[PDB]
């Protein structure tokens, strides 16, 4: 079954790059209708940047969620 | 930049999983407008599962091929 070689690929591509900030805990994300968003960062350290003043990791990938456009 | 994360995933994507069937030849696939469409099988194994009646194999996975939806 299709939608399930995509689900398994975003379980992994969720799983196998942390935060590119912190580098250990997870990215935050959310699901935006049809599509996944993986944000580049966890949410502590989203927060943090905005503090620090660095907007350099900000930003996210959308994933579409099914096999089928 | 994120674009290229997506990039780069889907270079990855493609390469570490071969045809479905004959598991050595990479992928069928084809640009369809915002997508790439990756069909589970080479164009070989394709047409001779016509051939042999089998139509297991058949599907594909579509990919948004931006960062952002
Ligand atoms: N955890 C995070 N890591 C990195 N960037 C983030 C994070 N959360 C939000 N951003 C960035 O801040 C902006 C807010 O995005 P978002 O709230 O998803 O947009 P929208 O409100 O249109 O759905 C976007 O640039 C997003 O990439
Ligand atoms: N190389 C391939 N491997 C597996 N399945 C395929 C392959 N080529 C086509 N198919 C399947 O046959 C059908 C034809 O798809 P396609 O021509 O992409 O649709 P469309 O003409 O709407 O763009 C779909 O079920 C597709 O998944
Ligand atoms: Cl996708
Ligand atoms: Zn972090
Ligand atoms: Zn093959």
Redesign the interface.
């Known amino acids: 079954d299709?939608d399930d070689?995509?689900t398994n690929?975003l379980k992994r591509?969720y799983r196998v790059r942390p935060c590119v900030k912190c580098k250990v805990a997870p990215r935050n994300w959310k699901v935006?209708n049809?599509?996944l968003?993986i944000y580049?960062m966890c949410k502590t350290c989203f927060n943090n940047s905005i503090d620090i003043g660095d907007d350099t990791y900000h930003?996210?990938?959308?994933?579409?969620m099914?096999?089928?456009?």
């Open positions: 299709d070689k995509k690929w591509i935006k049809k599509h968003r580049n930003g996210h990938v959308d994933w579409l099914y096999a089928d456009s």
